[PDB]
Write a protein that binds this DNA or RNA. Structure first.
Lengths: 46, 93, 102, 63, 77
RNA sequence: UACGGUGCUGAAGCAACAAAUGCCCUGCUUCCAGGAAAAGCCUCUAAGCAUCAGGUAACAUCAAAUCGUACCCCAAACCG
RNA sequence: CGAAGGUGUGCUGUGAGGCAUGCUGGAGGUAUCAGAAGUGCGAAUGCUGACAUAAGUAACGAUAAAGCGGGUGAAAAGCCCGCUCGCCGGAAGACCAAGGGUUCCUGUCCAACGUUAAUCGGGGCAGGGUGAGUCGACCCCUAAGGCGAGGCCGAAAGGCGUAGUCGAUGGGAAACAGGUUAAUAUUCCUGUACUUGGUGUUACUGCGAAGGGGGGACGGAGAAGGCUAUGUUGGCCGGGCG
RNA sequence: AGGACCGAACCGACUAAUGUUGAAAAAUUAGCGGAUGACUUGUGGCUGGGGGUGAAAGGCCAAUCAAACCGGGAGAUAGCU
RNA sequence: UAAGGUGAUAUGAACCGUUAUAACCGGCGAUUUCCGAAUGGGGAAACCCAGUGUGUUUCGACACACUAUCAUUAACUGAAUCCAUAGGUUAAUGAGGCGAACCGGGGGAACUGAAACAUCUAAGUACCCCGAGGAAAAGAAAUCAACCGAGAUUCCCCCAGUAGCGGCGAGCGAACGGGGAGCAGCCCAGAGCCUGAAUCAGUGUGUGUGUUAGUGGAAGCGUCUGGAAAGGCGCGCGAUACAGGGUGACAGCCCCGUACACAAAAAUGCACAUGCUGUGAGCUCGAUGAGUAGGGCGGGACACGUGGUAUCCUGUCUGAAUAUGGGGGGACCAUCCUCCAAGGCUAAAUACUCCUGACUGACCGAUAGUGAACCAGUACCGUGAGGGAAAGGCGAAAAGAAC
């Protein structure tokens, strides 16, 4: 059956990637919480 | 021209294997590990000027590093670059 | 600086070798020393198929603590504590109890 | 060798620069990775010696 | 934004109260109009977004003094 | 012939018929529901440059960098 | 000359408890009298770990199907080789994109992984392996759409949007046959090619744009005609006469 | 010609049986409907929570939907167990 | 500082050093790839693609530097239009982003409580956003008080759960006045006399002290048990040092230290002194903050829910007097008292701990204490925001088991 995760790298990055978190106020606050929690990978880039 | 300070840092090791060996003893090509940011003009110039031979053409691939592990600790090795340096008819090394 | 140091002759104060004199072979940055003929352990090691294969039970010296030795006076013939004085801008060690520079 | 490099001219540290890289450094990378070169400490001392020549060369040139 | 360029009147907040006193949030807005003011010393029309008492204070202080205040506080006209 | 193969040599190499959903075909006929854009490409000149620069043609010579390239891919390698 | 702790025994108090001591343990314990409490668990479909129970029970994942000989091995229904048998064959073959990321190939090991055994493996360990002017990306151009100098707007954050700038799933230059590696190949080698730019020489010469025109430039259905891939048969050639 | 007819790919899901600690958190097998169209599909894009989208079922919005998920107010409150 | 070193798992190999250019520690420098505000354009972060200028004795290719936007200032240009403005180009200076809490401001819930609920509460809390500093804010009476007086702001203890506000329910809750911490006042609206007169600010220098490496640092032996002694027994010594940690069991005297006494080539923080620059003292006279105070309507803040409601703030409409004047004194009037708004600056007491050092605990001791004693915000889960583990201890010494 066709499950929910149908992967695509270009949609992974355009959607949840770094240049797209940095592109706005609230994604920069996301990166700030991931750095502050101290996190090995911030976004999902590769 | 390429400066000689750049041109010394490019070639890194001769690559020893059996594909390399049959490339030397069968098709004049010496195979050698180069700098990761080394272009084909740099490798050609560096073999022209550091082994004093005449290079016909260079073919460069980039080899991806293998994820090994020690114990239960993984790690990728490291990517390197391998240059197939096709020499002319007059060569030794 | 360091009181017990490299080419120096010491006596052993505590354990298994109490009262045995000997010369310091080397001195390890753990705060230990290897002194010759003193703390002999009977290692037995495998004959590795590389370069030469001794096998057997090799009797080595082990590292004893620096605080378990004190340097041998030989003018009194007993153990003696060490101080540091300045002589002609040289920080020298000296024996306590007769105050002699080593 | 730190005052010894300090007392030459810019041209002469460029000469011993290119000879540290040329003669020493490259031939020991090629010699090291081809099974030869028992003496591995030479790699270290050559590398640090190129660091000295580039340091004195930056200090001599201008500021 | 709805700021008078002369008096600096933002919209403020408040309550609709009702006869049962039910508090609701509202905004009081300034009476902002975009009026075109002749300046004689420059011989030009400078158009401003004034309140309807920014026009009172322009009628009293004069347009030149007001423009000197806007140029003074970095308000660009 | 380390029987795994490795080299050497090597004849004929045509015709008839059938034939696509591929090609001519971005065609042709027709139908309303009336069927992307912009560059490369070809041309026209304006400002300018005009015995220079540029254009065209032939010849020679140099360059064409960088990254991907394994392997699975209707699946024991992807999503489950 | 042996603490706490652990595990027995004996004595003792109305009880919660106390005391002595054998063995294990191997370095801490604490009277008395006061002081403070994370101060006492059998229950909360309590939380965490361990271990039972059913129980050596159901199951071992398409009813495409195996049989034998030989090899390796400590051991072979399963691995390798051979001969037979069966299954798919518009797929259960072959080539990719997406996605994965070394699973590829070779040697070596059988602990765990493999619903069994395993000498085998997509498992462990080590080494090797991915070669481009022509394939694809990058690149030039754009669609939907994004972002957006100024700008218009908005308590602030910010919304929208012009110029622009990005954005393929579309438009734009060029390579084919044969051979080769254990593992790459339109990339390596052999042969034969083609494309676009730079520079130089020579001959002729009006060239020149974020500007004008053409072109690119593009629907559904249907119908034949001409072909080819491909196949079948004959001829030819080599082999067989069972 | 045709929201034309029969019928594979392709899309679907009418019946039955199995399965129901499954081979599978919705399938398999045997039949079944559409199959040039209001079709189907790939790649990208856009719409967002009292909001979207809806040939409308309160359906769908990441195995979640009469108001998603995450985090916080927050140890809500619980005359009840 | 130094006789030993080349960081750890983690041994090796190859070496460096031993009286000073091994190594280690500190000050100041040098280098500091790529991404990231990312800033030359773009982008799917760690990649793609440039332009301009300078230079390159093989300049058919390389190397270096600059090129973001915005604000301010200046220069040169420059439309519709003549002058001119808009605009354009270049240069100089500044900004941009991150960060735990504290602080000010712009917005701002609901669950809950009221034994229902709507006013009210929760609560100007949570949260979102802007801005700033080492603190911020406030602040030098148009303030109280009360016919006596006090004398800016901030913080603490009372006042006082008081007066009051309150579906007069639930609840909310002052001030006056008192005691303390700390204490500091000034400038512009404006001319003349007069000048550098105190004042601070920016810098140099000198002194003092502190930080960033360090140095010296007392005093014990015998015997018994024991694997081992620091323990038992016996006899000594130190102490401005018996804080603590290690050492083969429990060490003042074995080791590192502690008390104590010293140390800086260099870079710095603070405090005096001093040089220069800027800045202005002080005197006389004058002025003494207008769409403002107040008002009407709507709303908010004041403990005060519009009530008899003073006071403050203002979205809207208006609108004075201006020292023979005006504000307040809790509706309001008169008398009396007090103060001078419509301009601004100002230390200390105060709040907080991302971070560093030292010390302390009737705090925890591996199901506790951080989620995390261990390569933990990891493995793993989720498209994503996000969620989020388990896992310490051989021995004194690997002597970690030759054969």
């Amino acid at each position: 059956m066709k499950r929910t995760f149908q992967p695509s790298v270009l949609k992974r990055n355009r959607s949840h990637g770094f240049r797209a978190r940095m592109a706005t106020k609230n994604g920069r606050q996301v990166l700030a919480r991931r750095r502050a929690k101290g996190r090995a990978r911030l976004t999902v880039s590769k | 021209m390429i400066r000689e300070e750049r041109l010394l840092k490019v070639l890194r090791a001769p690559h020893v294997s059996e594909k390399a060996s049959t490339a030397m003893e069968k098709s004049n090509t010496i195979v050698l590990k180069v700098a990761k940011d080394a272009t084909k003009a740099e490798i050609k110039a560096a073999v022209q000027k550091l082994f004093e031979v005449e290079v016909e053409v260079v073919n460069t691939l980039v080899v991806k590093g293998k994820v090994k592990r020690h114990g239960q600790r993984i790690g990728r090795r490291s990517d390197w670059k391998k240059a197939y340096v096709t020499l002319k008819e007059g060569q030794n090394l | 600086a360091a009181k017990i140091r490299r080419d120096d002759e010491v006596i052993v104060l505590t354990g298994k070798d109490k009262g045995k004199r000997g010369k310091v072979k080397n001195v390890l940055s753990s705060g230990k020393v290897i002194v010759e003929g003193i703390n002999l352990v009977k290692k037995h090691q495998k004959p590795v198929p590389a370069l030469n294969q001794p096998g057997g039970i090799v009797e080595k010296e082990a590292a004893i603590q620096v605080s378990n030795v004190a340097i041998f006076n030989a003018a009194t013939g007993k153990a003696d504590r060490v101080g540091f004085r300045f002589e002609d801008g040289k920080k020298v060690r000296f024996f306590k109890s007769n105050s002699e520079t080593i | 060798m730190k005052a010894k490099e300090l007392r030459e001219k810019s041209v002469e540290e460029l000469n011993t620069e290119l000879l540290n890289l040329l003669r020493e450094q490259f031939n020991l990378r090629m010699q090291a990775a081809s099974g030869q070169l028992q003496q591995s400490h030479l790699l270290k001392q050559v590398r640090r010696d190129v660091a000295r020549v580039k340091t004195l060369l930056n200090e001599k040139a201008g500021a | 934004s709805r700021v008078c360029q002369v008096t600096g009147k933002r919209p403020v907040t408040g309550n609709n109260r009702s006869h049962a006193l039910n508090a609701t949030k509202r905004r009081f807005l300034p009476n902002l109009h975009s009026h075109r003011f002749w300046v004689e010393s420059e011989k030009r029309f400078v158009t401003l977004r004034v309140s309807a008492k920014g026009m009172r204070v322009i009628d009293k202080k004069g347009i030149d003094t007001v423009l000197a205040e806007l140029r003074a506080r970095g308000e660009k006209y």
